[PDB]
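pipeline/complex-builder :: batch 7 item 3
reading input block
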Amino acid sequence: DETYGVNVQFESDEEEGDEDVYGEVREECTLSAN
Amino acid sequence: GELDMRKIGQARNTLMDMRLSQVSDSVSGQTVVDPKGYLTDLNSMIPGGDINDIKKARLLLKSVRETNPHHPPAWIASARLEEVTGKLQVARNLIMKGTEMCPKSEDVWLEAARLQPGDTAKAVVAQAVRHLPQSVRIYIRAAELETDIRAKKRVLRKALEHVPNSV
Amino acid sequence: TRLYLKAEQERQHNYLKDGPYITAEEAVAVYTTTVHWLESRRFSPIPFPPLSYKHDTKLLILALERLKEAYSVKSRLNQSQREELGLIEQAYDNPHEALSRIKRHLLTQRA
Amino acid sequence: NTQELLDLLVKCENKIQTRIKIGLNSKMPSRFPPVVFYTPKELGGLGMLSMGHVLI
Amino acid sequence: TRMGDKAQRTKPQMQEERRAKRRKRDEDRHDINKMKGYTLLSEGIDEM
Amino acid sequence: LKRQEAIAQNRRLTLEDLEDSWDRGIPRINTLFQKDRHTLAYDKGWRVRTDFKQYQVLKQNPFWWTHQRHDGKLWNLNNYRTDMIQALGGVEGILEHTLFKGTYFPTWEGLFWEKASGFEESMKWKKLTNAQRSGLNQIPNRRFTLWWSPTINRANVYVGFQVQLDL
Amino acid sequence: KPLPAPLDGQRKKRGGRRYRKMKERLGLTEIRKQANRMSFGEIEEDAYQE
Amino acid sequence: DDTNVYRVTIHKTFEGNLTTKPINGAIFIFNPRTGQLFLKIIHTSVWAGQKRLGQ
C-alpha cells in the first residue's frame, strides 16, 4: 500500500533497570632479547 | 669558572640512555608503529553527515516504527537509517524486526535481503516465500544469491512451478 | 601544600643537579633482568591501537563513562569543568572522530 | 573483635548526635529522643545508621 | 547478637514482567524458529 | 551448574532461575543478568583504577574496595530500615512524636514531602550572595526542627525555661 | 578588586518572548516532578542507596 | 487530540535513500458540547531544523 502520511510518537520511553529486560540470560612478536 | 649544575646531570642522563639503548639494541621483538604511516593512513577511513541530524532521523524512524510496526516503508526507513549510520548488524536486526512485524511485505523482505549477508539472505528469501509466495522479486533475490548454476536452475524451476506467468 | 610544593621543586632541582640517582650499571642489570623475565613469559608487546580495533568503541565508551562518573551532580561546575563535560558529551556524540583525535594526540602531542 | 573500634564508633555517634542537637537546640538537651535522629528519611527523620546499643 | 540478624538477601524485582516479556518473545518467534533450518533449495519438506 | 544445565537444553538462563541468589553470588550480589554485562566485562582493571582514583579526585570515596556496577551490591540494608521503623513504635508511633497529627492528613501512605521544593527553587536559579546561599541551605534545618518539634519542645527534653509565644 | 553593592532588582513587569526566552534556555525548566516528591508513606529506593 | 500532529513523507525514493520530507502538521480542537471545530495547523518549518528533541 502507499500509506502517504505517518504520524510519529517521540516520547521518553524505554526504562532499563541495569538488567536484562526479559528473564532469559542476556549474556552472549613477543617482548624478548635477541 | 661558573658552575653548570645541569651539565653533569645531562651528561649522566645521556650516558645512561646510551648504555640502555645499547642494552635495548639486543632486544628480540620490540615492535614499532611508524607515526608517519599511521597519520597518513588515519584519513584512509574518514568520512554520514551531521551527528545531530542523524540522531534526529533515527529518533523519527524509531517513532514511526513504534507508531506503525506493520509499516514496511517505516521498517525500510529504519533499516536505511541504521545502515547509513552505525553498523550493519543493527540494520539487519531492524530489518528482521520489520519483517516479523509486517508479514507479506516484499519491500521489507528486499531490505532484509540487502541488509543481511547471503547466508542470512537465503533464509530471509525462504521466509518471504513462506509468508508471501508467488513473488517475482523474492524469487529473483533467491536466484541471484545462489552463486551456482544448479542452484539458480533449481530456483528458476521453483519460480516457474510457483508462478508460471512471469516473463 | 605550599611548603610541600617548594620542597618538591627543590628535590627536582637537586635531582637535575645530582643527575640520575640510579647508576648506569644497575639500570642495565635491571633492564636485562626485566628483558629475561619478559622473554621467559613470552609477552607479546601491546601494539599501537589499530585503525580498525574490534573493541575500540567499547574501550572508548568505558573510558568516557569512568571519567564522567567523577563529575557528580553538584550545585554548579567550573568553566574548566563545564568544558570537560562538553568534551565528554562530544566524544559520546562522535566516537569515531573522538578516537581519531585521541590517536592523533597520542602519536603527536609529546608536550 | 576490635573493641577499640566499637568504642570509637560509639564515640563518633555520640559526637554526631551532640552536633545535631547543638544545631537544633541552643542549650544541652537532656536526653533528646533517638526518634529525632534515628528515624528514616522517608518519615522525616535524619536516617542515622548507627552500630550503638541505643535501646528504644 | 548474631552475624546475619536483620540481614536480608534482596530478591530480583519485576520478575513477572520479565517472564511475560520472555514468553512474548518466545511466542512471537515460533514460526521463525519452526522454519529456521529449512531452506528453499536444499530442503525436501519445504514446499510440502 | 545452572548455566550448564540450561546450555544442555540450549536455552538461556532465565531470571526466574536462582532469582534469590541475586543478592548472593560470587560477585557480591550476582548481577550477571544486569544490563551491559558484556560491555563492562571487556574493560578490565577496575580495582586499580578505583584505588588510583584517590589521587585523581579531591573527594574521599569510602567505597574504595569495589564498585557497585562492577562487583555488585555487597549489602542489603532494607531490612535494617524496616526494623528501625518497627522498633521505634511503628509508623504510627514514629509519627506520634512528630507533628503529622496536626496536619490533619488522614493518609499515612498518600502524603508526599517536597524534597528541596518548599519555595520556587529556594532562589537557586539566581545569583545571590554567599549569605543568602547559607540561609537557603539552613532553611531545611528549620523544617526538620518543625517536623520533630513536639518530640523536642517537651519540657522533659530540655531544662525548665518555659516561655510562651506572644499572643 | 571592588565588591558589588548589596542591591537587588527593583520590580518585575516584563515576561514572555522578552524574558521568557532566557528562563527557558539558560534557566530551563526542569522536570519539577518525580524528583522533588518523597512519598513519606513508602520507600522507593534502597535503605542506603543514596 | 493532537496525536497526528507529527507528519512526514517517509516515502521510499527509487534509489539511494528515502524522501525525508516532513509534512505540515496540525492540532485538533473540537467541542462536541457546542458543535465547534477549530484546527490549528503546525507548519513543517516550525518542526524542522529547531535543534530539539520530541519533548
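note: Chain D has two helices and no strands.
queue -> next item
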